[PDB]
Design a protein around this motif. Structure first.
Motif, PDB file in Angstrom:
ATOM      1  N   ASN A   1       2.018   0.143   6.818  1.00 55.34           N
ATOM      2  CA  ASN A   1       2.476  -1.202   6.478  1.00 55.34           C
ATOM      3  C   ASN A   1       2.878  -1.986   7.725  1.00 55.34           C
ATOM      4  OD1 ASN A   1       3.925   0.425   3.688  1.00 55.34           O
ATOM      5  ND2 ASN A   1       2.148  -0.943   3.598  1.00 55.34           N
ATOM      6  N   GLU A   2       3.781  -1.420   8.536  1.00 58.65           N
ATOM      7  CA  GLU A   2       4.210  -2.096   9.757  1.00 58.65           C
ATOM      8  C   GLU A   2       3.018  -2.428  10.642  1.00 58.65           C
ATOM      9  OE1 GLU A   2       5.298   0.795   8.695  1.00 58.65           O
ATOM     10  OE2 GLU A   2       7.425   0.595   8.203  1.00 58.65           O
ATOM     11  N   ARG A   3       2.045  -1.519  10.715  1.00 63.71           N
ATOM     12  CA  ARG A   3       0.823  -1.818  11.448  1.00 63.71           C
ATOM     13  C   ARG A   3       0.102  -3.009  10.835  1.00 63.71           C
ATOM     14  NH1 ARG A   3       0.555   3.880  11.570  1.00 63.71           N
ATOM     15  NH2 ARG A   3      -0.987   3.903   9.872  1.00 63.71           N
ATOM     16  N   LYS A   4      -0.095  -2.998   9.511  1.00 61.09           N
ATOM     17  CA  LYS A   4      -0.714  -4.138   8.837  1.00 61.09           C
ATOM     18  C   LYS A   4      -0.066  -5.445   9.263  1.00 61.09           C
ATOM     19  CE  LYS A   4      -2.395  -1.816   4.646  1.00 61.09           C
ATOM     20  NZ  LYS A   4      -1.877  -0.434   4.850  1.00 61.09           N
ATOM     21  N   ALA A   5       1.266  -5.462   9.362  1.00 60.13           N
ATOM     22  CA  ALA A   5       1.943  -6.632   9.917  1.00 60.13           C
ATOM     23  C   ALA A   5       1.493  -6.896  11.350  1.00 60.13           C
ATOM     24  CB  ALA A   5       3.462  -6.444   9.855  1.00 60.13           C
ATOM     25  N   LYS A   6       1.431  -5.846  12.173  1.00 59.60           N
ATOM     26  CA  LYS A   6       1.188  -6.034  13.598  1.00 59.60           C
ATOM     27  C   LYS A   6      -0.247  -6.466  13.891  1.00 59.60           C
ATOM     28  CE  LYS A   6       2.805  -1.975  14.712  1.00 59.60           C
ATOM     29  NZ  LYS A   6       3.589  -1.629  13.496  1.00 59.60           N
ATOM     30  N   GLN A   7      -1.231  -5.593  13.655  1.00 59.05           N
ATOM     31  CA  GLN A   7      -2.606  -6.008  13.903  1.00 59.05           C
ATOM     32  C   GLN A   7      -3.118  -7.017  12.883  1.00 59.05           C
ATOM     33  OE1 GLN A   7      -1.976  -2.694  13.207  1.00 59.05           O
ATOM     34  NE2 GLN A   7      -2.968  -2.309  11.229  1.00 59.05           N
ATOM     35  N   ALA A   8      -2.362  -7.315  11.823  1.00 60.24           N
ATOM     36  CA  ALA A   8      -2.732  -8.458  10.996  1.00 60.24           C
ATOM     37  C   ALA A   8      -2.303  -9.770  11.637  1.00 60.24           C
ATOM     38  CB  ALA A   8      -2.126  -8.340   9.598  1.00 60.24           C
ATOM     39  N   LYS A   9      -1.164  -9.777  12.334  1.00 61.22           N
ATOM     40  CA  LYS A   9      -0.765 -10.970  13.072  1.00 61.22           C
ATOM     41  C   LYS A   9      -1.634 -11.170  14.310  1.00 61.22           C
ATOM     42  CE  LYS A   9       3.646 -11.690  13.550  1.00 61.22           C
ATOM     43  NZ  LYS A   9       5.021 -11.420  14.047  1.00 61.22           N
ATOM     44  N   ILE A  10      -1.875 -10.094  15.055  1.00 66.61           N
ATOM     45  CA  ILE A  10      -2.502 -10.148  16.370  1.00 66.61           C
ATOM     46  C   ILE A  10      -4.004  -9.909  16.214  1.00 66.61           C
ATOM     47  CG2 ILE A  10      -2.277  -9.328  18.756  1.00 66.61           C
ATOM     48  CD1 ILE A  10       0.513  -8.363  17.979  1.00 66.61           C
ATOM     49  N   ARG A  11      -4.474  -9.897  14.959  1.00 67.49           N
ATOM     50  CA  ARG A  11      -5.898  -9.720  14.671  1.00 67.49           C
ATOM     51  C   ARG A  11      -6.779 -10.633  15.519  1.00 67.49           C
ATOM     52  NH1 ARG A  11     -10.393  -9.134  14.610  1.00 67.49           N
ATOM     53  NH2 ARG A  11     -11.849  -8.595  12.924  1.00 67.49           N
ATOM     54  N   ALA A  12      -6.277 -11.808  15.892  1.00 70.06           N
ATOM     55  CA  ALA A  12      -7.030 -12.726  16.737  1.00 70.06           C
ATOM     56  C   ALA A  12      -6.992 -12.336  18.209  1.00 70.06           C
ATOM     57  CB  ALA A  12      -6.505 -14.152  16.562  1.00 70.06           C
ATOM     58  N   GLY A  13      -6.309 -11.246  18.555  1.00 73.69           N
ATOM     59  CA  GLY A  13      -6.344 -10.706  19.900  1.00 73.69           C
ATOM     60  C   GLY A  13      -5.658 -11.525  20.976  1.00 73.69           C
ATOM     61  N   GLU A  14      -4.373 -11.816  20.790  1.00 69.70           N
ATOM     62  CA  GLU A  14      -3.557 -12.480  21.802  1.00 69.70           C
ATOM     63  C   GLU A  14      -2.349 -11.609  22.104  1.00 69.70           C
ATOM     64  OE1 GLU A  14      -4.434 -13.856  18.982  1.00 69.70           O
ATOM     65  OE2 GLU A  14      -5.802 -15.509  19.457  1.00 69.70           O
ATOM     66  N   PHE A  15      -2.257 -11.134  23.345  1.00 67.71           N
ATOM     67  CA  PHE A  15      -1.171 -10.271  23.794  1.00 67.71           C
ATOM     68  C   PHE A  15      -1.368  -9.973  25.272  1.00 67.71           C
ATOM     69  CE2 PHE A  15      -4.565  -7.617  22.186  1.00 67.71           C
ATOM     70  CZ  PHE A  15      -4.765  -6.712  23.208  1.00 67.71           C
ATOM     71  N   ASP A  16      -0.277  -9.567  25.926  1.00 66.06           N
ATOM     72  CA  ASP A  16      -0.369  -9.126  27.312  1.00 66.06           C
ATOM     73  C   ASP A  16      -0.784  -7.660  27.415  1.00 66.06           C
ATOM     74  OD1 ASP A  16       0.338 -11.657  28.094  1.00 66.06           O
ATOM     75  OD2 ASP A  16       2.440 -11.172  28.500  1.00 66.06           O
ATOM     76  N   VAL A  17      -0.161  -6.787  26.622  1.00 68.68           N
ATOM     77  CA  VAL A  17      -0.304  -5.338  26.773  1.00 68.68           C
ATOM     78  C   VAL A  17      -0.177  -4.684  25.402  1.00 68.68           C
ATOM     79  CG1 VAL A  17       0.719  -3.245  27.766  1.00 68.68           C
ATOM     80  CG2 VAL A  17       0.545  -5.290  29.170  1.00 68.68           C
ATOM     81  N   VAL A  18      -0.959  -3.628  25.178  1.00 72.37           N
ATOM     82  CA  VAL A  18      -0.828  -2.764  24.007  1.00 72.37           C
ATOM     83  C   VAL A  18      -0.295  -1.416  24.468  1.00 72.37           C
ATOM     84  CG1 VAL A  18      -2.040  -1.482  22.231  1.00 72.37           C
ATOM     85  CG2 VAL A  18      -2.543  -3.875  22.571  1.00 72.37           C
ATOM     86  N   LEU A  19       0.842  -1.006  23.911  1.00 69.28           N
ATOM     87  CA  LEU A  19       1.424   0.310  24.153  1.00 69.28           C
ATOM     88  C   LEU A  19       1.200   1.159  22.910  1.00 69.28           C
ATOM     89  CD1 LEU A  19       3.201   2.318  25.805  1.00 69.28           C
ATOM     90  CD2 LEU A  19       5.189   1.154  24.837  1.00 69.28           C
TER      91      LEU A  19
END
Length: 48
Positions: free
Chosen positions: A24-42
């Motif tokens: 679920n928390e992932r669904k929130a995360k890569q659902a928000k950032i699905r468009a691929g905007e970020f500095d770094v993925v840990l």
DNA sequence: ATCAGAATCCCGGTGCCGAGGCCGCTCAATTGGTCGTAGACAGCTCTAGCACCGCTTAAACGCACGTACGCGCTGTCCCCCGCGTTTTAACCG
């Protein structure tokens, strides 16, 4: 969360995408950032 | 809970055809030899099987609750059994 803790106090301004817990928390995360905007993925091993 | 009575066990007697022993007469089992070869044993390689933990998550587990159905009970009716009579096809020679 350690590596994120040195990503916290030892420097700001570079965001972080973690992966933990239930899907679920992932669904929130890569659902928000699905468009691929970020500095770094840990991430960790089995999540790739 | 009990006698009348029909079926069954028990016992003594009798007759017979298959079990059991005998005797030639083989022919397959035993012995003696070879001869090649399957596998017994030692050795070498290296693959998959064993244990274990890290980590995630689909499945199992415990529980609350409803109602679907298993089971007990009753009534009905129908059909299969017990027996007598009559016929016929099995049986035995």
């Amino acid at each position: 969360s350690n590596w994120s803790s040195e990503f916290a106090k030892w420097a700001p301004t570079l965001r972080t995408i973690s992966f933990k817990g239930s899907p679920n928390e992932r669904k929130a995360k890569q659902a928000k950032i699905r468009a691929g905007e970020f500095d770094v993925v840990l991430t960790t091993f089995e999540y790739i």
